[PDB]
């Protein structure tokens, strides 16, 4: 049908990626250790107050 809404300052893809489930770590068992503390894909904690989805007015400034 029609292209993206106003086709300016929007992601080329969809928006349904926002429906990802939240993150909760798997706690250690009772009196035994896990080797899970060996990974590399650690996500730094960050604040909010940022443009999300269509609010991303991407433009070359």
């Amino acid at each position: 049908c029609s292209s993206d809404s106003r086709y300016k300052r929007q992601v080329s893809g969809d928006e349904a990626y926002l429906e990802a489930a939240p993150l909760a770590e798997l706690h250690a068992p009772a009196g035994m250790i896990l080797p899970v503390t060996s990974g590399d894909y650690a996500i730094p904690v960050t604040n909010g107050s940022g443009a999300v989805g269509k609010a991303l007015d991407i433009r070359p400034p």
Binding site: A20, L23, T46, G48, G50, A51, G53
Partner: peptide, 20 residues
């Protein structure tokens, strides 16, 4: 990105995309 510029205006979307 999130390691280099965690104080930018794109950090929230970057974290969400990392989640995905």
């Amino acid at each position: 990105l999130v390691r280099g510029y965690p104080n930018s205006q794109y950090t929230t979307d970057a974290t969400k995309r990392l989640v995905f």
